[PDB]
Amino acid sequence: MNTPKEEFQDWPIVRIAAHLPDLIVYGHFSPERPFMDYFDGVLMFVDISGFTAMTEKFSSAMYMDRGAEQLVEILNYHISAIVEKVLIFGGDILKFAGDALLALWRVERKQLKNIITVVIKCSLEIHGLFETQEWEEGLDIRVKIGLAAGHISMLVFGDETHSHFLVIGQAVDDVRLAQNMAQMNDVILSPNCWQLCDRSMIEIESVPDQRAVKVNFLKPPPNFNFDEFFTKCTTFMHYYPSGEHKNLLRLACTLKPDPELEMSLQKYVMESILKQIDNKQLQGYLSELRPVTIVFVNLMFEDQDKAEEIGPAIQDAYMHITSVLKIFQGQINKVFMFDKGCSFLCVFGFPGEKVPDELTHALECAMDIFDFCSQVHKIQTVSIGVASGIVFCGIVGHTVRHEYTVIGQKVNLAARMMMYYPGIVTCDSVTYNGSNLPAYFFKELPKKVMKGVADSGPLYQYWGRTEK
């Protein structure tokens, strides 16, 4: 009797699972919104820092109308190799944001020390991928890595149709601080990561005026064998592909159809992505250089450390944000923590979602979100940056682990505006000029020097309809 091999694994549920971490795929949590959960882990924040001198160059006549296609191809080539490294070393990629990603090794406290060693080896191996690498004949392309460790809270919020999750807490804020101390080729350890790590393994140098450390070397003891040590470490990794599935990058590739699980997983994924997953849209339709308006919403909390307070506040803000965005077919593309503030990357004019007067509407939506969230219990400050122009849209990452993302100078500008101009709604010159709304709706702002942005152009506050 024949025994044909190679099981089917290309189900819709498996395609949806590529867009999600194991944290969600295998999460099995309660129906309530918000849901909060508490654990320990190691975080890795990887930034690709060459990928700016190419995005706006991919929008040039050089690329002959295939700018977005060439951009996503070369980015995915490089990001895919980082993803395979994280997955093989047992990490869970939480989220992609442009040419950057956050990964998690979740583990019980007693295993943090050994898991840190695994995450350090992974990090140096990621740097090794880029040792003699270039984008074009002249531009290097290297990464910066921040590592943090300790207590981590997960927040899941949303409504009956949409879900979003966030990691929160001091380790999360730590990994961002560690990452932006990093220079090209660095691995920076947060102060608590350094306090928790196996110091007999790792040669460090001090970071001036910082308690965070830079890794110089991983110098193993005489009888140390990384492969055997890694094997011992997989004992504590719930979902590490093993045995029969030792050849897979993710246990999620083995997901079987399950209507209840699929209903729950699809809530995290945009409808245009689901349409492609269902073979009802061309697989390449979402890769594009596209004019859009970014509405970047930051919420700062009265107690920035009180996870139990911030959960309901984010839930309340989200409930109103989603209802305002729906009206103009605007989308939440990402949510993440930024200076212990909750940030919503909102996008107007996505594929099949472009509607006229996009600019007037992004501004009125921003103000609507601003007025409501300002009155949300425990929200201390609302800040909104609005910028409009050509941005890259596309699915970024590896075949087994990828997310739809936006990349471009206007994305970074809206993010810098909400941080540098807190407590107000700001917009760039494109939005101001193209709103045609009368000038007295705006206030022209002092020019601030903003990290990463070279000549923002004139910036404005959206003052609104009245003097009050």
Strand partners, 208: none
Task: List binders of ligand 1Z6 among 343-362 (CB under 6 A).
Answer: 345
From residue 98 to residue 127, the character string flagging contacts with ligand 1Z6 as x (rule: CB under 6 A) and all else as - is x-----------------------------
Q: How far is the CB of 343 from ligand 1Z6 (least distance, A)?
A: 7
* Candidate ranges 75-83, 191-199, 209-217, 402-410; the one touching ligand 1Z6 (CB under 6 A): 402-410
DSSP assignment of 157-211: EE-SS-EEEEEESHHHHHHHHHHHH--TT-EEEPHHHHHHS-TTTEEEEE-TT-S
> Are the C-beta atoms of residues 332 and 344 closer than 8 Å to each other?
yes
Among 94, 122, 393, 415, binds ligand 1Z6 (CB under 6 A): 415
Identity (one letter) of the amino acid at 188? I
Q: Which residue has the tokens 């951009």?
A: 71
**Position 412 contacts ligand 1Z6 (CB under 6 A):** yes
- Give strand ranges (E) for 304-419: 331-338, 341-348, 379-398, 401-407
CA distance 360 to 363: 5
Closest CA to 404 of 2, 47, 139, 72: 72
Binding mask 262-301 for ligand 1Z6 (x = CB under 6 A): ----------------------------------------
Q: H or E stretch including 412?
A: helix 409-420
- Is 334 a binder of ligand 1Z6 (CB under 6 A)? yes
Choice between 75 and 112, CB closer to ligand 1Z6: 75
Tokens of 77: 């080539």
- Choose the one of Cl ion, ligand 1Z6, none that binds residue 98, judging by a C-beta under 5 to 8 angstroms depending on kind: ligand 1Z6
Where does this chain touch ligand 1Z6 (CB under 6 A) — which range of 2-10, 59-67, 173-181, 404-412? 404-412
Tokens of 157: 């919020």
Is the CB of 123 or the CB of 412 nearer to ligand 1Z6? Answer: 412
Judged by CB, which is closer to ligand 1Z6: 188, or 253?
Answer: 188
Q: Which of 104, 120, 167, 362 binds Cl ion (CB under 5 A)?
A: 167
| Three-class secondary structure of residue 457 per DSSP | coil
426 near ligand 1Z6, judged by CB under 6 A: no
**Element spanning 296, H or E:** strand 288-301
How far is Cα 239 from Cα 249, in angstroms, rounded to an integer? 11
Nearest distance, CB of residue 383 and ligand 1Z6, angstroms: 12
Is the Cβ of residue 269 or residue 427 nearer to Cl ion in the bound state? 269
Residue 340 half-sphere exposure toward CB, CA atoms < 13 A = 17
Site of interaction with Cl ion (CB under 5 A):
166-167, 336
Numbered residues of the known binding site for Mg(2+): 47-48, 99
Residues within the interface to ligand 1Z6 (CB under 6 A): 97-98, 334, 345, 405-407, 411-412, 415
